[PDB]
Design a protein around this nucleic acid. Structure first.
Lengths: 135, 111, 144, 148, 102, 214, 56
RNA sequence: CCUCCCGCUCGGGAGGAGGCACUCUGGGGGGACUGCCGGCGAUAAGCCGGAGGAAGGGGCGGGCGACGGUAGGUCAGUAUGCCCCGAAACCCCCGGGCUACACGCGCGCUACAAUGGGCGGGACAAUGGGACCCGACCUCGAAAGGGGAAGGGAAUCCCCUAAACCCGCCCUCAGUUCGGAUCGCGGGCUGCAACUCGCCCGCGUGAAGCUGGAAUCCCUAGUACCCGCGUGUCAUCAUCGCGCGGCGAAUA
């Protein structure tokens, strides 16, 4: 068989993925892909897996562990890594360029994540000032 | 039930412990934990007045004492902050604070 | 061919809560829904399901965790209390529905207290579950 | 169903609506929304159905769980007033007992000459602090208890 | 022999690394088996403070860092092979803790 | 819950929100073709960051554009499952997360009556809700005019979707029109150009006041 | 006349009046309790010798 | 390899051996510089557009604020010229006052419901703080809390549960099951002591408010908008100040 370990990181959901051959296993943090309640962020994970095909999804075991705060955050870290897990597998430029033309959130993360809350002039949030009315 | 409690007299004979089940959470606490060394010199001047050595008109800065059944009858002088305001203590005053009855402000109209 | 891991938590909970009516060892005591309930409820419900879900969770949680305490399962529910116009804050549930529940499971043989100081599953609590999940995971492929 | 009505009378002659049993009693002063669902249990009814679907026989089961609730069950913190005026153990409160018991204790303080009774006469919260400018632009809290 | 832990922290970066490196160099050659100098966290300490003593207008607010870094070292040597290695000069200002177990 | 999972087998294949094929519709006008993300795929939430570039906002999934101009109204106050709200408004004093549900249920409530691919009723409601002409109180040379200004295909879309999203919250106001409904009954009637769309009443008036002034 | 000593003798078990600094000798003004009891104003003057860093 | 469960015997999951791969931790190194390509520009400076690429043309966010001025602000933090007090404008003490209100405004929180409420279930973080201090876990108590007690001066233990989310169920748009003021009572907790003047828990009580005139403020992207989370100071008053991550735009 094989072991190709990859990563996928979006807004600090770090997905730890492994792609070995088998029988159609989809593991997320220990639980099948079935346990999630929002239908929505599931479909996001599902986007790459059809762009390539069910053929390669069925023939390969994917276990990922996404330690990330967001529900959509987890999903997004799962969308970037499967796509990178499937481009290392087959090896061709056909599956890589087909992802890039569709969206760059499969193969690029961000350049940025979050900004600090500025000291500010005694109010709440990074970018805000106390209200004025002294004119 | 006219007169607060079982009867005015039976709550002078139940003092420590048996009153407690009747009282608020707040009055219990200050009896049960105890009160300060000025509250110990106020147990001589209620006792000089009910009997014996020449009675002083009882004065107090005690506004954290909650009225008991033995102290019902005396005319208590509670310093409002400037001067002493009198209160004739009743059996309907069992279970309230002593600093309620004397004022914490002069009582006038606002404007 | 199934664990509590393989079944969604919306289909698992009415299948274990029924299997807590049926067996029929765990039951509602009368004092626990009446007015000894968890924090504030907009209404108090007169449900068997109410008791059978607060316990059907307890057999899933001790599976995942080791030393799962009373102070953990009181704080694990999710729910608040008003202070006023000051915004709400995070408080914990009623320890009465959690300290009788573990003990209704403890007499049933589903949960046991370990000698390290804590709460773990027995084999009888672990098999009661894997059978109820083998029935749920089998039905989830039949149904489009 | 158990014989449709739109107005059955519960708790004396005061009226039970067609909203829901748990909300129809809340109105009846003394029975709230948590205390309504404590007397649905003892009596043996479905709580979530409409009000007015009651024969004559259900209306008698509620009026005797009200007169003395501390006889049927109802814990000694889950009943309306526990430990009353220093010598009643527990009682019930209803539109006539609640109105009288709260004006009595207020009649008691004014004679006592306290800082609670005259603070309910001038127009003020006692422990809520600010009278500084709240109830602002001519406004008013309405203190206790009803401007509807 | 006696497995010793040298747990060595310092308030600044330059002072902590020189000692960690020197401790792994001198101990290497004698009667010592030594496990490598492992870096644990910086419990960076934030003091977040009001500049202005008026507390007036806009007041610009100082962010403070105190960063304290912790290297850890297991070693298999005697209590006599330990002092030989604890000879070293050490920056001001570098805390060196020693637990001793067999 | 079982239909829900069929809604997970079906978007896979590929379809929006679980059961709307993105091929059902076409953009017949060559104006609104590059300005619309009908053609690309699956999820709005995306977080693909826009306004990054000059037209970093044209490539926005039509529905995502819907979600956040449908999310708009919002201050200060605090939401959580507690007792707790409003704080997420008559238009998300809060997130695109519980926003995306509203638009999904509004695609469900507009599919239930019309029975067409709802992405053929909304893309038929954002080519009609946009006015073709606007007057700006524009002065140039110190001389105050109120002038013929024609509208650009990007600034069209925006006035289409925003007027659709502004009309519904006047109606949902403390009313049985739920935004999942109040939007679904705005999107049908902006597609039609009906006399009941607070979004096709400004479209017209903004062209008609702007014709007088020209 | 004659009387017994005074150097204050009342309760000051806890609060701000319990504290004083080790540089400007105050009760109500700031007392940073990390084992560095000073006011906020001293703190700013003292820190570069402490080894704190301005940079965020 | 080994212990436990389940099984359609194909196969799913946990523990410990075992293994440092991965995440991560903190120390160091490379990578972006208009380098290249086109267009505009005096072939210069520079601006625009393009390719490759994780990232681009101040990459992005902070700290970093000259000579001075408003006689701005503070001698009520300290330092200090001058003046004034001297059983006092000192000193000690208890109690009261700063928390008084017919009202006016500023800055904010909470809020006028179906994008909703109850109930249940399930999937998810980060900064931090923790010795008379964080407190596992076990027990009693409806709960607030009390009794017992492990670990922890810290990547190794604890606060700790994230919240928003979603799925099913009950409920079916009224000043209401909204909203929580006000008042009665029962009860805990700290301190000598919370009436004046603390917070929470339970039952009863259940006020204004059903989208707000003139006028006016804040901000330009991982930002605003939104959701919780921690810390400071610290017994206790936080709808505050500082700071963290989760969802994630409009227009320019």
């Amino acid at each position: 068989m094989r072991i190709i370990q990859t990563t996928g990181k979006r807004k600090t959901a770090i997905a730890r993925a492994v792609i070995r051959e088998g029988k159609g296993r989809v593991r997320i943090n220990g639980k099948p892909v079935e346990i999630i309640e929002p239908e929505i962020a599931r479909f996001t994970i599902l986007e790459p897996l059809i762009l390539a095909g069910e053929e390669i999804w069925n023939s390969v075991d994917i276990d990922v562990k996404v330690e990330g705060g967001g529900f959509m955050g987890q999903a997004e870290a799962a969308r970037m890594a499967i796509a990178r897990a499937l481009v290392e597998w087959t090896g061709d430029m056909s599956l890589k360029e087909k992802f890039m033309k569709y969206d760059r959130t499969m193969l690029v993360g961000d350049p940025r994540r979050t900004e600090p809350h500025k000291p500010n002039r005694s109010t709440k949030g990074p970018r805000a000032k106390r209200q004025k009315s002294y004119r | 039930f006219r007169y607060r409690g079982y009867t005015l007299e039976q709550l002078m004979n139940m003092s420590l412990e048996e009153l407690a089940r009747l009282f608020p959470a707040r009055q219990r606490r200050s009896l049960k934990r105890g009160l300060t060394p000025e509250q110990k010199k106020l147990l001589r001047k209620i006792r000089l007045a009910k009997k014996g050595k020449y009675k002083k008109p009882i004065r107090t800065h005690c506004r954290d004492m909650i009225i008991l059944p033995e102290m019902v009858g005396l005319t208590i002088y509670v310093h409002n902050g400037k001067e002493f305001v009198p209160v004739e203590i009743k059996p309907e005053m069992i279970g309230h604070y002593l600093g309620e009855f004397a004022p914490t402000r002069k009582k006038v109209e606002h404007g | 061919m199934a664990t509590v891991y393989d079944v969604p938590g919306d289909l698992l909970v009415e299948r274990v809560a029924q299997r807590l009516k049926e067996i029929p060892e765990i039951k509602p005591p009368e004092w626990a829904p009446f007015v000894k309930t968890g924090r504030h409820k907009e209404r108090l419900p007169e449900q068997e399901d109410w008791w059978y879900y607060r316990v059907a969770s307890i057999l899933r949680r001790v599976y995942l965790d080791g030393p799962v305490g009373i102070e953990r399962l009181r704080t694990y529910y999710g729910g608040r209390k008003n202070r006023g116009h000051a915004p709400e804050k995070f408080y914990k549930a009623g320890g009465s529905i959690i300290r009788k529940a573990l003990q209704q499971l403890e007499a049933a043989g589903f949960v046991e207290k370990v000698p390290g100081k804590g709460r773990v599953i027995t084999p009888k609590g672990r098999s009661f579950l894997d059978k109820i999940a083998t029935e749920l995971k089998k039905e989830l492929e039949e149904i489009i | 169903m158990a014989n449709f009505r739109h107005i059955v009378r519960v708790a004396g002659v005061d009226l039970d609506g067609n909203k829901q049993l748990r909300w129809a009693l809340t109105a009846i002063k003394g029975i709230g929304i948590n205390f309504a669902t404590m007397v649905c249990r003892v009596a043996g009814l479905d709580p979530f159905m409409k009000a007015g679907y009651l024969t004559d026989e259900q209306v008698k089961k509620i009026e005797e769980i009200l007169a003395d609730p501390v006889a049927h069950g109802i814990p000694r913190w889950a009943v309306n007033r526990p430990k009353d005026y220093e010598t009643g153990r527990d009682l019930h409160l209803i539109t006539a007992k609640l109105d009288m018991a709260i004006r009595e204790d207020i009649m008691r303080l004014r004679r006592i000459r306290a800082y609670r009774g005259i603070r309910h006469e001038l127009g003020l919260p006692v422990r809520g602090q600010r009278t500084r400018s709240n109830f602002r632009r001519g406004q008013t809290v309405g203190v206790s208890r009803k401007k509807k | 022999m006696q497995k010793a832990r040298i747990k060595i922290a310092s308030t600044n970066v330059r002072s902590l690394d020189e000692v960690a490196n020197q401790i792994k160099q001198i101990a290497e050659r004698t009667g010592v088996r030594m496990s490598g100098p492992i870096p644990l966290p910086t419990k960076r300490i934030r003091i977040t403070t009001r500049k202005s003593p008026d507390g007036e207008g806009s007041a610009t607010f100082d962010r403070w860092e105190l960063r304290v870094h912790k290297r850890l070292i297991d070693i298999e040597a005697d209590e006599r092979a330990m002092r030989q290695i604890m000879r070293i000069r050490v920056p001001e200002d570098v805390t060196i803790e020693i637990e001793l177990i067999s | 819950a079982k239909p829900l999972n069929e809604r997970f087998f079906i978007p896979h294949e590929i379809k929006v929100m679980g059961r709307w094929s993105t091929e059902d519709v076409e953009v017949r006008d060559p104006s609104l073709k590059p300005y619309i993300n009908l053609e690309p795929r699956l999820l709005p939430h995306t977080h693909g960051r826009h306004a990054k570039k000059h037209f970093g906002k044209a490539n926005v999934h039509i529905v995502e554009r819907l979600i956040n101009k449908i999310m708009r109204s919002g201050g200060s106050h605090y939401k959580v499952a507690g007792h707790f709200m409003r704080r997420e408004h008559r238009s998300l004093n809060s997130k695109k997360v519980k926003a995306y549900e509203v638009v999904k249920e509004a695609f469900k409530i507009i599919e239930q009556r019309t029975g067409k691919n709802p992405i053929q009723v909304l893309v038929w409601a954002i080519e009609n809700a946009a006015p073709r002409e606007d007057t700006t109180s524009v002065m140039f040379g110190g001389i105050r005019y109120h002038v013929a200004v024609d509208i650009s295909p990007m600034r069209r879309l925006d006035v289409a979707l925003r007027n659709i999203a502004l009309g519904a919250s006047a109606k949902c106001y403390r009313n049985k029109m739920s935004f999942a409904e109040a939007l679904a009954e705005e999107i049908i009637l902006a597609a039609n150009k009906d006399p009941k769309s607070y979004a096709y009443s400004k479209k017209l008036e903004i062209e008609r006041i702007a014709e007088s002034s020209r | 006349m004659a009387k017994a000593d005074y150097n204050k003798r009342k309760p000051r078990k806890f609060g701000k009046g319990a504290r004083r600094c080790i540089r400007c000798g105050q009760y109500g003004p700031i007392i940073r309790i990390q084992g560095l009891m000073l006011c906020r104003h001293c703190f700013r003057e003292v820190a570069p010798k402490l080894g704190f860093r301005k940079y965020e």
